[PDB]
Amino acid sequence: DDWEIPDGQITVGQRIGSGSFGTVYKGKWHGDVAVKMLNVTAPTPQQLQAFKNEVGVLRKTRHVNILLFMGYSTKPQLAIVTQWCEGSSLYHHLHIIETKFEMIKLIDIARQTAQGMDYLHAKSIIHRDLKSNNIFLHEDLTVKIGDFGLATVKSRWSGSHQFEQLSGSILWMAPEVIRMQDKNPYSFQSDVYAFGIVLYELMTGQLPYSNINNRDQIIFMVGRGYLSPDLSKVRSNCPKAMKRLMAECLKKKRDERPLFPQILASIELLARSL
Amino acid sequence: LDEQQRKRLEAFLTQKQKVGELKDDDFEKISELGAGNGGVVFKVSHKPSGLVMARKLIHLEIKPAIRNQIIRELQVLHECNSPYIVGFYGAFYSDGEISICMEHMDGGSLDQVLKKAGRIPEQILGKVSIAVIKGLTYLREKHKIMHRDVKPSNILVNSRGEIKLCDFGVSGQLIDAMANAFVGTRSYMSPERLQGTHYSVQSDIWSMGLSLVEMAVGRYPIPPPDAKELELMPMAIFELLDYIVNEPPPKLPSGVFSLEFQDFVNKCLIKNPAERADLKQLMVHAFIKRSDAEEVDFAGWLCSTIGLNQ
Numbered sequence: 001d002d003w004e005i006p007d008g009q010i011t012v013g014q015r016i017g018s019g020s021f022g023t024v025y026k027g028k029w030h031g032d033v034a035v036k037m038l039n040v041t042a043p044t045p046q047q048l049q050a051f052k053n054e055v056g057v058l059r060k061t062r063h064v065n066i067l068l069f070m071g072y073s074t075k076p077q078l079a080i081v082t083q084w085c086e087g088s089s090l091y092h093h094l095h096i097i098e099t100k101f102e103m104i105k106l107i108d109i110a111r112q113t114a115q116g117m118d119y120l121h122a123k124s125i126i127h128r129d130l131k132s133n134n135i136f137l138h139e140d141l142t143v144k145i146g147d148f149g150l151a152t153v154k155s156r157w158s159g160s161h162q163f164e165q166l167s168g169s170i171l172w173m174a175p176e177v178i179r180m181q182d183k184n185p186y187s188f189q190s191d192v193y194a195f196g197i198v199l200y201e202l203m204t205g206q207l208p209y210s211n212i213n214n215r216d217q218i219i220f221m222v223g224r225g226y227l228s229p230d231l232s233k234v235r236s237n238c239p240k241a242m243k244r245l246m247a248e249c250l251k252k253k254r255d256e257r258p259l260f261p262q263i264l265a266s267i268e269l270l271a272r273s274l
Numbered sequence: 275l276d277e278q279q280r281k282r283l284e285a286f287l288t289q290k291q292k293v294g295e296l297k298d299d300d301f302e303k304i305s306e307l308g309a310g311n312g313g314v315v316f317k318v319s320h321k322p323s324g325l326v327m328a329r330k331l332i333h334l335e336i337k338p339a340i341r342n343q344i345i346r347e348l349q350v351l352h353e354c355n356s357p358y359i360v361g362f363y364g365a366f367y368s369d370g371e372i373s374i375c376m377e378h379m380d381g382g383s384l385d386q387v388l389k390k391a392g393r394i395p396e397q398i399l400g401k402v403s404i405a406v407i408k409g410l411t412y413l414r415e416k417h418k419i420m421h422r423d424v425k426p427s428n429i430l431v432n433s434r435g436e437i438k439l440c441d442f443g444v445s446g447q448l449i450d451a452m453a454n455a456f457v458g459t460r461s462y463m464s465p466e467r468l469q470g471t472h473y474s475v476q477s478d479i480w481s482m483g484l485s486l487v488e489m490a491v492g493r494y495p496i497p498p499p500d501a502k503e504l505e506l507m508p509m510a511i512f513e514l515l516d517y518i519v520n521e522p523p524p525k526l527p528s529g530v531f532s533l534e535f536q537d538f539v540n541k542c543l544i545k546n547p548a549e550r551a552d553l554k555q556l557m558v559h560a561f562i563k564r565s566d567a568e569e570v571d572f573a574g575w576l577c578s579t580i581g582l583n584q
């Protein structure tokens with residue numbers, strides 16, 4: 001009930017890359033793990049206790065579509081140890097390797113994603129950073145979602161307060177999240193919005209706003225409700241019941257978006273009618 | 275150009291010829307110069323020619339087709355040869371990162387100089403404005419490309435008193451790739467770009483003004499300084515962008531700076547792009563005519579500020 005890895009236990013190896021809130025190295029620790037060196041290297045004791053409290057809840061998560069959260073360390077610097085995944089992320093497949101899946105397997109990717117998300121929300125866990133970068137395709141089969149939760153090692157702390165400096169990639173952020181002016185922006189429906197964008201990735205093979213090449217323009221227009229994913233770009237072979245679902249997740253007003261229990265049901269229903 | 279500039283321009287082309295194909299093994303890493311939200315820059319030695327250059331490394335996760343197009347589009351930089359544009363030696367790809375190799379500027383970016391200096395003097399910001407205007411001009415005429423990213427961190431300076439531009443949008447595919455970056459903390463984007471698209475050189479000129487005010491006061495000027503923070507002479511990214519669009523433009527304090535300088539920045543920061551001054555106007559504005567006449571020692575002021583020898 002005090003999950004803390006000491007020093008000399010983790011064989012830190014090759015540098016892999018950095019993201020919204022840390023840099024990732026391939027380590028060893030009773031097998032290959034993922035060592036994410038958080039960007040809050042000097043954490044305040046009020047911050048540090050809330051991080052411990054959150055790791056406690058992430059440690060009690062076990063689901064076929066969730067990446068195993070193993071614990072943390074603080075000896076060299078504050079870090080995170082999670083299951084290492086072979087094979088590329090869904091972002092790699094769709095936008096780098098340009099893998100050619102069939103609509104069956106595309107829909108299957110959507111289903112297991114909604115499966116794991118439903119488990120996370122069932123345990124009252126807001127992902128806060130759902131994107132195709134955080135969805136790995138383990139052995140070209142099962143979907144595994146990582147980088148979930150961790151609200152406390154995102155956004156610097158003052159001394160006892162915390163205010164999410166909007167960080168992450170802006171393409172998956174719900175408009176209410178963009179604006180950051182609604183007390184608690186990150187919600188179950190903000191994840192649903194993110195999941196909507198991932199649907200857009202699956203169904204169009206493109207990222208959203210393909211014609212816009214100004215980061216701050218997206219931020220402003222999406223936040224003001226002026227910009228919305230051009231659903232015209234959906235492939236011709238894509239199911240109608242699929243396009244409709246995508247659109248219900250992307251509603252500008254978060255209260256109109258469905259929750260995952262209903263979202264997951266729709267995907268299984270249209271998986272049959274195929 | 276005059277004589278001291280034609281000398282230095284032709285002197286660069288000579289050292290550039292001693293450089294052939296750029297490989298990753300030909301470089302020895304000296305020190306890191308800086309980093310941003312999408313790049314890191316090292317001072318490096320090119321072993322085949324002993325030259326010292328700056329090497330920007332961009333790690334992008336893009337498909338190879340797009341990546342190869344970016345390298346191709348960057349090779350236009352072998353044609354930009356002005357005393358107001360940073361030198362370009364080559365660009366290539368290797369070990370999963372794009373390298374842009376450019377000439378070293380031992381003063382660094384004006385963003386760095388501003389931290390060391392606190393505030394920058396109007397007599398110095400005069401000479402800086404001259405160069406940024408002349409650099410935007412050379413880009414607008416001889417190449418019909420627009421910067422699209424004017425800010426203090428992209429204006430470079432050196433011990434020979436030069437003031438050069440860099441990081442100007444020559445490769446659109448790179449720009450579009452960098453669009454899927456994480457949010458920054460602050461913006462220099464004109465209010466029309468935040469709402470639509472580039473409006474010719476005018477939307478760069480806004481950026482120049484917002485940089486001038488930041489450098490002149492020592493603080494990013496959105497939102498404008500408090501009533502008593504100013505006599506002492508954190509907003510969300512979206513709110514700043516809403517501020518830039520739907521609130522009056524920032525200005526300089528009325529007492530501290532000349533009226534020519536206050537007008538210069540005000541003409542630059544007009545929210546309507548068309549009413550906003552263009553290069554032809556600024557080039558013959560009062561503040562520029564005066565600041566071009568003054569014989570300021572920029573090299574000396576730079577080396578004193580950093581702490582270097584004369």
Ligand SMILES: Nc1ncnc2c1ncn2[C@@H]1O[C@H](COP(=O)(O)OP(=O)(O)NP(=O)(O)O)[C@@H](O)[C@H]1O
Pocket residue numbers: 016017018019020021022023024034067082083084085086089129133134146147168169
């Ligand atoms: N558990 C993991 N196993 C293997 N590779 C990983 C793992 N987590 C992250 N990576 C890789 O590490 C690199 C950077 O990851 P990461 O820091 O999580 O960036 P990101 O996922 O792109 N954005 P974000 O997850 O929100 O911070 C990417 O190439 C990932 O695919």
Ligand SMILES: Nc1ncnc2c1ncn2[C@@H]1O[C@H](COP(=O)(O)OP(=O)(O)NP(=O)(O)O)[C@@H](O)[C@H]1O
Pocket residue numbers: 307308309310311312313314315328330360376377378379380382383385386427428430441458
């Ligand atoms: N040729 C150069 N000579 C010296 N310093 C340089 C050179 N090019 C870049 N730098 C420095 O490198 C730093 C970071 O590189 P850069 O990629 O331009 O990030 P940035 O402009 O500061 N912010 P961003 O554009 O948001 O990533 C700059 O602040 C400069 O100090």
Ligand SMILES: O=C(NC[C@H](O)CO)c1ccncc1Nc1ccc(I)cc1F
Pocket residue numbers: 310311312313330332351359360361362374376439440441442443444445446448449452
């Ligand atoms: O670098 C660019 N954009 C920001 C990037 O993130 C680096 O900070 C960038 C985008 C498009 N075309 C060219 C770019 N570079 C660049 C251009 C001219 C010179 I001389 C030197 C340079 F490096």
Ligand SMILES: [Mg+2]
Pocket residue numbers: 019133134146147
């Ligand atoms: Mg990730």
Ligand SMILES: [Mg+2]
Pocket residue numbers: 310427428441
């Ligand atoms: Mg730059």
